[PDB]
Design an enzyme around this catalytic site. Structure first.
Site, PDB file in Angstrom:
ATOM      1  N   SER A 184     -12.386  -4.237  -5.529  1.00 25.05           N
ATOM      2  CA  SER A 184     -11.334  -4.451  -4.544  1.00 25.05           C
ATOM      3  C   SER A 184     -10.302  -5.486  -5.043  1.00 25.05           C
ATOM      4  O   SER A 184      -9.679  -5.269  -6.118  1.00 25.05           O
ATOM      5  CB  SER A 184     -11.996  -4.754  -3.184  1.00 25.05           C
ATOM      6  OG  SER A 184     -11.046  -4.605  -2.127  1.00 25.05           O
TER       7      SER A 184
ATOM      8  N   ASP B  43     -12.323   5.486   2.296  1.00 25.35           N
ATOM      9  CA  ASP B  43     -12.031   4.058   2.337  1.00 25.35           C
ATOM     10  C   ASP B  43     -10.852   3.749   3.298  1.00 25.35           C
ATOM     11  O   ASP B  43      -9.747   4.286   3.171  1.00 25.35           O
ATOM     12  CB  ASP B  43     -11.687   3.593   0.920  1.00 25.35           C
ATOM     13  CG  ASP B  43     -11.814   2.064   0.726  1.00 25.35           C
ATOM     14  OD1 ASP B  43     -11.529   1.273   1.683  1.00 25.35           O
ATOM     15  OD2 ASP B  43     -12.208   1.588  -0.356  1.00 25.35           O
TER      16      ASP B  43
ATOM     17  N   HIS C  15     -16.050   1.533   1.698  1.00 28.78           N
ATOM     18  CA  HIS C  15     -15.406   0.620   0.713  1.00 28.78           C
ATOM     19  C   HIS C  15     -16.460   0.006  -0.291  1.00 28.78           C
ATOM     20  O   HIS C  15     -16.256  -1.087  -0.891  1.00 28.78           O
ATOM     21  CB  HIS C  15     -14.583  -0.418   1.509  1.00 28.78           C
ATOM     22  CG  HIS C  15     -13.793  -1.398   0.684  1.00 28.78           C
ATOM     23  ND1 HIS C  15     -12.914  -1.021  -0.293  1.00 28.78           N
ATOM     24  CD2 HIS C  15     -13.693  -2.756   0.777  1.00 28.78           C
ATOM     25  CE1 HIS C  15     -12.354  -2.107  -0.822  1.00 28.78           C
ATOM     26  NE2 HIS C  15     -12.835  -3.178  -0.207  1.00 28.78           N
TER      27      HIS C  15
END
Length: 186
Positions: free
Chosen positions: A70, A136, A163
């Site tokens: 991320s 996501d 995610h």
């Protein structure tokens, strides 16, 4: 000697998600992996994340690999842009990677504001991949596919990956270990 560094995202540390699993799975092969913690994960600042990465800068070589999740993704992209390298790192894997503002987390805009030098990133990492979840809701899949195109990275779509968080069941992530390992055989 191979070295793998693992870098987390917003509101995370080295104990969260799939990072401990990946470190230990690599150790089972005799591969050294270190999960790096970033400063102030609840209010992250790009300059401080880059300064932390720079603590390790002297260890980065052709058999070094960076796996990021991320927010760690745009962070290591910015890091590679400004790194003087004698040769490309072994590779990078960007889990839920992105290189533009996340509408639901605009507080993190400083990590992605401005264009990236794609050619420098390509030349900085021999092997490149993006792993992304179709469903996501934090990093839209399209943003990860866009980034994969920009940096000529192999894209691996997981149809139902959330995610890739521990509260979605992702305390392990075999696809990351397998993609990484394929780099070593090459």
């Amino acid at each position: 000697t191979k070295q793998v560094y693992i870098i987390h995202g917003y509101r995370a540390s080295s104990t969260n998600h799939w990072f401990p699993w990946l470190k230990k799975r690599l150790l089972a092969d005799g591969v050294q992996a270190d999960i790096l913690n970033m400063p102030n994960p609840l209010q992250p600042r790009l300059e401080d994340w880059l300064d932390t990465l720079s603590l390790y800068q002297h260890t980065l070589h052709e058999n070094t690999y960076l796996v990021a999740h991320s927010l760690g993704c745009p962070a290591i992209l910015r890091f590679l842009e400004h790194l003087q390298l004698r040769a490309a790192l072994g590779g990078i894997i960007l889990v839920s990677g992105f290189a533009k503002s996340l509408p639901t987390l605009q507080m993190l805009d400083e990590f992605t504001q401005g264009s990236f030098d794609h050619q420098k990133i390509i030349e900085s990492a021999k092997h490149r991949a993006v792993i992304a979840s179709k469903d996501d809701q934090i990093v839209p899949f399209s943003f990860s596919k866009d980034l994969a195109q920009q940096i000529d990275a192999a894209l691996y779509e997981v149809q139902h990956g959330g995610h890739f968080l521990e509260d979605e069941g992702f305390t392990s992530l075999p696809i990351v270990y397998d993609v990484l390992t394929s780099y070593f055989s090459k």
